[PDB]
């Protein structure tokens, strides 16, 4: 066994080794290993992406106009965000400016995704870490109704409703076919909700499973379908016609009316179901404000998102702020530049890839994706990993760093960046939230805080849907219908050689696509995705990434039941297909 110091942690691989493979209630394939000491506290954590497809390789030789369609299939959970980053990147390379309506519609697509993805994460992915479903069977329906009514105006609160939900659960489980609840962690001592809260939360799980399908009807209107809507280089393909012959063939007033109806319902669900549930998790799980901090009090990163001024990606345009904090110095939010070769770099000394020199990091314009499965001694064989060898290569995920620093990305990172840049809305919202929980601001830098911030962001995005819709309608009232620029659609109009960067804030954090075009075709296409940052393996300095850091120092009540590991990992909303691409 060995030990070393990094980022204030003591990484010690002595002691019992625990393996969690597969990690469930995530997207894609992950393995996690930890070592625990004699007090059942984690002293080493190992994040491993257990899949790879090679989109960066597949994209070579494609027409740049087609790229969005391929890269959208990086991930069906954060569906759309890679298409958006792609069209941004290709437009940046070629020098294309899209019409205002196209930009507004793209912002609607992104905000729709934030609402959907954050909602489903809260309930379907993370929720069972916090709600003991089986314990709901012990709840009193009338006390459940009282609890729900004390927390929210949401209509669906009758005692008979909670009894009906409970009875449905009872009958589901009574024949022994527990389905997704089989062999869960029910009864673990870290389940702290009372039975009534478990029943309320379970009812809401089901309500969210039903309601989420409606949100994506916005994607169907503008993008044809969800999952995997359509886009174009130069804007969007959803031509608008409000008052002319043939509006039946276009986005017309009826289509826009449908979109508005979804916006209102989405805001109401998030504000009156998810928000009070998130706050209630916080109220009953306050100790988790001190667990899973990781890098969130050290190094956080946002690129920024939602340009409100079409084709302007600067600070005055982006409605979701960008910036970086390092060394715990939240008084100095630093600017990010995605072209600067000294900023974003990826290392592969601990990943299954080949570089000519694995002791150096490569900016994505110099990126290389040459897969090399080389696990070393794993106490089994190349086809039987019993214990990953974290002293050498242990993941399909590359290791991104920013100025050589290991960073956390995602809702909590973004919230901290906006708060510390002095965004007045963010400051007010976060202060009010922490006040309601009677916790200090530092309580947000935690596993609980990640969950709170995600819910915050769903509320913010639902509000921004209405803002963007209203902006589109204003343009239409002024007779501004354009949705595409085609001046540079034809390859004969493009530079013979050019490169560009497309960036945004996906639900899970900072996303970039770097594209080089030569002779009408993609010469290089490199992606650095939010879960690539968070789930990163180590670098030549031995620095650990966000997941490994957040797991460090965590107490486990019952080593064989990894509930505390699941809670912290799930709080980041891992997307392993995204991470590896």
């Amino acid at each position: 066994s060995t030990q070393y110091e990094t980022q204030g942690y003591t990484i010690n691989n002595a002691g019992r080794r625990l393996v969690v493979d597969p990690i469930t209630r995530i997207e894609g394939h992950m393995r996690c290993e930890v070592n625990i000491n004699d007090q059942n506290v984690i002293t080493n954590a190992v994040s491993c992406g257990t899949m790879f497809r090679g989109l960066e390789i597949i994209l070579q030789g494609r027409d740049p106009r087609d790229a969005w369609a391929f890269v959208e299939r990086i991930c069906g959970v954060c569906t759309g965000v890679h298409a958006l980053a792609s069209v941004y990147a290709i437009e940046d390379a070629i020098g294309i400016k899209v019409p205002d309506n196209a930009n507004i519609i793209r912002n609607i697509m992104l905000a729709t995704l934030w609402c959907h993805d954050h909602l489903v994460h809260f309930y379907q992915l993370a929720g069972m870490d916090w709600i003991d479903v089986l314990d709901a069977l012990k709840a009193d329906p009338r006390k459940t109704s009282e609890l729900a009514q004390s927390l929210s105006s949401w209509p669906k609160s009758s005692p008979g409703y909670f009894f009906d939900v409970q009875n449905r659960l009872k009958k589901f489980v009574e024949g022994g076919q527990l389905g997704i609840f089989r062999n869960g962690y029910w009864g673990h001592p870290q389940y702290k909700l009372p039975p009534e809260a478990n029943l309320m939360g379970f009812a809401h799980y089901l309500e969210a499973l039903d309601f989420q399908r409606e949100i994506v009807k916005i994607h169907a209107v503008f993008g044809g379908k969800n999952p995997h809507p359509n886009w174009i280089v130069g804007g969007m393909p959803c031509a608008i016609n409000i008052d002319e012959s043939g509006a039946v063939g276009a986005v017309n007033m009826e289509r826009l009316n449908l979109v508005q109806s979804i916006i209102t319902r989405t805001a109401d669900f998030i504000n009156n179901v998810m928000i009070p549930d998130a706050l209630a998790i916080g109220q009953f799980n306050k100790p988790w404000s001190e667990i899973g901090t990781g890098l969130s009090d050290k190094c956080v990163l946002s690129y920024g998102a939602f340009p409100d001024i079409a084709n302007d990606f600067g600070e005055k345009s982006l409605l979701m702020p960008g910036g970086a904090v390092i060394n715990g110095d939240f008084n100095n939010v630093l600017p990010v530049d995605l072209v600067d070769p000294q900023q974003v770099q990826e290392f592969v000394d601990h990943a299954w890839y080949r570089y000519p020199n694995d002791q150096v990091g490569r900016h994505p314009f110099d990126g290389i994706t040459d897969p090399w499965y080389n696990p070393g001694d794993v106490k089994g064989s190349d086809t039987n990993i019993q214990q990953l060898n974290e002293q050498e290569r242990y993941s399909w995920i590359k290791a991104p760093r920013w100025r050589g620093n290991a960073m956390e990305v995602g809702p909590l990172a973004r919230t901290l960046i906006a708060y510390h840049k002095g965004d007045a809305a963010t400051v007010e919202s976060v202060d009010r939230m922490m006040s309601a929980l009677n916790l200090p601001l530092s309580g947000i830098q935690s596993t609980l805080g990640r969950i709170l911030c995600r819910a915050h962001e769903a509320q913010w995005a639902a509000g921004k849907l209405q803002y963007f819709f209203d902006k589109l309608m204003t343009n239409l009232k002024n007779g501004n219908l354009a949705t595409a620029s085609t001046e540079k659609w034809e390859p004969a109009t493009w530079p013979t050689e050019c490169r560009g960067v497309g960036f945004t804030e996906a639900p899970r954090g900072a996303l970039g696509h770097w594209a080089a075009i030569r002779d009408g075709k993609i010469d290089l296409y490199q992606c650095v995705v939010p879960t690539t940052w968070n789930a990163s393996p180590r670098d030549p300095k031995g620095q650990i990434g966000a997941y490994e850091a957040a797991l460090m120092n965590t107490k486990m009540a019952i080593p064989e039941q990894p509930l505390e590991i699941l809670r912290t990992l799930h709080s980041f909303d891992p997307c392993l297909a995204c991470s590896t691409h």
């Binding site: 130069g234 804007g235 043939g246």
Partner: protein
Amino acid sequence: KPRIPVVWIHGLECTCCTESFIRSAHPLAKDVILSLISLDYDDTLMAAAGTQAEEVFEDIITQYNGKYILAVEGNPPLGEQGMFCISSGRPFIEKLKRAAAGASAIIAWGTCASWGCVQAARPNPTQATPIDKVITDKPIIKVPGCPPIPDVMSAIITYMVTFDRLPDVDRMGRPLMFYGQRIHDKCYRRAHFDAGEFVQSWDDDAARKGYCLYKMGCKGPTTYNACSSTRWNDGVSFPIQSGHGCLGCAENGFWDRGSFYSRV
């Protein structure tokens, strides 16, 4: 009254088919899970992880040997000894084979499981291979699309439950009910195709009247699916209705048939 056991496994994938399933409008996915099937294993939704998830898998496939349906999303990579997709420390293909051996039938959801999809597009770095090239002794129902339509997935499920049999299939294993006709033979823009009324560039006057997308690369003429009739997301839209040609996403090899913007 017990529900039919279902094991849902995931190879190399993007998870769109699982997402599509939960979009079902009728029956709701909630009601499928609670009332129509017993979804006994599914990495995206299940409570158990790690050793507890391995125990569920092993217990179900043993207890219900010969009696469960295997749903597969994604595909196995043959490169690097299969270790481009690792589950419980071992190649995914081993899990696929074990799950297949006990299944009564297999549903290959999506173009990944059916044919290969994006990871199999040139140059196929991982040697991603569709299910039916690995599992050769089981009924396999292919339900292609990237992803398939939500209410097509749930209709196929309810057909099998209600009627207690597999759907009848074409020569490729696709259900005739939803894959027997081409997009282009049920497309509401076909009048425009017939009349030579085409979009020529995005957002032109033709586009604003809903003219045909053939000259913009629509692959509807060679693609079999239900998008132009059943439509997507509670019937709200489909690619062509919202102004983009069909990509061909239900068809084998659609990524490598030339640019999406080049004509059939």
